[PDB]
Symmetry: D3
Subunit: 201 residues, 6 copies
């Protein structure tokens, strides 16, 4: 997990030419002000008119620099009816979330030694879920109304590996012949999938 802090506060210095280190260098405390432990970036709903039908409003250290060194971060996800936060993975953290409105099918997948078990449940307002570090998971809006959830992570920068986008639209894309052997389908099927993720989202 993220390294523990070695002082009370260390607000991230995000200017482009700052020296680079594991995580982020910090602003001098003299330049921090009173406001760094607070944020209002998750107050409004994100735009759900996207191919996935969901919008992620991030609140990691790049968006909330006061989280630097503190080992935590959050995000908000809004969903149009039938929208999905597609099968994805956080490489460096466990996720713990709460559904605020609507009805979401939440699915968590065990690794190979857990027999690739799929745990899935319809989670409603006020109900919570937990996603173990590095496991594949997804959310699907099964209600007729817009849904939204707010989650927390045990990292300032959990990272996100979107499975569909990484598999078919990385930069540059995984060679077709690699994907035909791995997916056990012909090249035409692989190219059809790639054509849907050519936009970069």
């Amino acid at each position: 997990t993220d390294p523990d802090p070695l002082q009370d506060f260390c607000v991230a210095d995000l200017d482009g030419k700052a020296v680079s280190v594991n995580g982020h260098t910090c602003k001098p405390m003299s330049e921090a002000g009173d406001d760094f432990l607070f944020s209002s970036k998750l107050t409004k709903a994100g735009n759900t008119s996207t191919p996935n039908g969901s919008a992620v409003t991030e609140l990691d250290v790049a968006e909330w620099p006061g989280t630097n060194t503190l080992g935590v971060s959050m995000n908000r996800v809004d969903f149009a009816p039938g929208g999905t936060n597609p099968p994805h993975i956080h490489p460096r953290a466990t996720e713990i979330g709460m559904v605020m409105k609507g009805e979401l099918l939440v699915g968590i997948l065990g690794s190979l030694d857990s027999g690739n078990k799929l745990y899935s449940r319809v989670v409603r307002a006020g109900e919570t879920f937990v996603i173990p570090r590095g496991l594949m998971h997804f959310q699907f809006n099964v209600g007729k109304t817009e849904a939204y959830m707010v989650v927390s992570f045990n990292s300032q920068n959990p990272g996100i590996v979107f499975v569909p986008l990484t598999l078919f639209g990385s930069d540059p894309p995984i060679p077709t012949p690699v994907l035909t052997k791995a997916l056990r389908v012909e090249a035409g099927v692989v190219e059809l999938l790639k054509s849907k993720f050519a936009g970069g989202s």
Copy 2:
């Protein structure tokens, strides 16, 4: 921070005679079912008719055994108008929270090397805050309506050190002469304070 997990899942075995270890032993996976990564315990508001005027609904590993080994936990706090979650400390975690309804004055205090600075702000619906590991902090409902927040921690068992209750109503209470030297007031003042925390809450 909490030790990282060494397998996908390890639901806590909470029976009274289970062997004791750092954290908790786990139920055999065969006895876990499909439901351990989910909870509905924070769906309803807690009873705010208490001396503090707030109610904490806990969702640590004792209440949500599926969090065992995953490094995270949550809780919900409800506040009557003018109620407080009094100055307190979490010995083993950073807290990250969101106000869901109402208006809360949230205050975070730096340690001695930070000049004991008090950072405080009125946090409203959808706005977030972060409390660094082990620092004193509090919340006070400044609105005319009931307020509530949901927070996450970077520990399965953050712990809570309530300052007023620990100082004046521990078991057994800190001797009066220790408290008169520390608080710089006469014994009568110390005894008055102790009389308010004799109930254990």
Copy 3:
């Protein structure tokens, strides 16, 4: 990363009814013998006549109990010509490997904040590679001969999330409608993919 050790040795007790904890309980030192720090399980090549065209011979704590608490483990992967270790993820570790024979295209994919960059190179005998914790990666045999590599991990139980098998053949499988929204293709395409992973491998 894995918790550090609190003593010299703690060989894993793998009997089925042993108490369950994070990681594994250990055999009494009196029952360990001289041989637990050694293994010969990776001496021979695995059977590459599988759908993927590769075979993984594991040497994690379940196969090498002397690794318990030491924070490390290994495995060997053998590849038939044109075979692949398909796009996969290790949820709890970084991997560091060496190609022993043959020619392998090794690809590592960055997360979303790294623009989903694909780093790929043909790695030959004696050459090494490193896969950051939790990122998607794969290997493909581009030579005309059988290839093999031996890798190490910074966990006693890294875990493996096989992307194709988890996406299309979990237990039970991810609903088709979830996968059609996520993959942006019709149900018939999703069902074709599922039919290839119905065997459990």
Copy 4:
């Protein structure tokens, strides 16, 4: 706990304009000399003519830069007869100490899940005590002579949250109305307490 070291030595560069990071940047090894692993700052007794009747001589990374990255630090506390190291907390470390001279009442308080138990004992020359990470604790000189102890921590910068001073004399002070609700006493009592900690110590 503090991050582990990634090299033998990394003496802290404490100049005011050094770049800021978690912990401290280090002096080039060429500028370190032979003396950084040693100190004589705890050889003499501190001045106990203070309001608390005790004096803390710190030996954290700010006073002993050679501790940077090594995960440890110390301090010495001297006590006039009847003096106290008041109820306080270390946010980022466990403390382990030894009484060198005199008789000290040492008290350690459990958190809420430990029923706020007060463990207290008179500790004399050569006797030791341990304070778990983040718990409230104090020391009181019950002998007729000056007493002193030397303690170690499992952090280069444990931090110190003095309860009385933080509660009544932070900068700026916690509002009176917050403190009257939390302490369950009238404003006049709160103002009396605040008047004793207006000096900043």
Copy 5:
């Protein structure tokens, strides 16, 4: 470093048939009493009439079970005039110590990338030293009186690798031919050294 604690207290259960885990299982809190955070085992001087001319009084988790899970431990070392705590290593911790009486030559050795530098200084009453995790170090009494020091570690079980005893008197001893190649001397010299450590101390 040692895993962080997941609760306030977890006194080690040291009975011989207790289940074995990383570190130690804990006594039920009901069986702990008030005394586990304290010890008087380092109050008296150890017997320095040994081949090394020094005596180590240990206060690790085997001798102080209340340290279990807290990440710290101590020990006391007493030295006859001209006695030594021979070149040794702690595999799992940094050491931080204070000389209480006498004059001790304290030497710390850097690793190969630090050019195997020897840092050494005569440390007197009240003066401190720090030994980075896993580096070779020693102490030698250069005064005419008995000397003693008390040290702390950042582990409940640091471990001790005595160089001379391990090299020449392990169980069973390292073969002579291995040692003649490594030490670049004839077999007769190696056998002479082995004869001095045949007693097991």
Copy 6:
């Protein structure tokens, strides 16, 4: 163990005047190229015509900067017939290795609480071994042909404490009188040993 990473990649900036921190600062991602996760430095055998009769080809972060922050590193050791990697220690990591060719006697020594037990075995092609963090260990070529092994570590910079060289040829050397008390032999024997390690290797 090494601090976990807080981003995907952080290639070490090894220029001499780069700011110094725990571990290494990183190159801007814009200056990294595609090649940092790969290396060919262990493809060839090292020169075994040395006093020890073995050659270590290092692949730590100084030689493979792409390992920075990832918690892993490797090395290759080649051995002439009868050559040794002498009794040594890695202060900051566990080692896990595989013999690639030849026959090596591999010995691992327990600490004092493990009764200084010597575990030793002849390890051949494809067979593996594990060395717990900070314990003394060695390898000796018992075959008639050149032998070689490739090992991995759970640190980007494990460090190496060569016992013979550190004991008798540090800079500057440990005083003779310290070594005569510790080794229990006369000064002439100590000086003979020192004369063999005066070259610095």
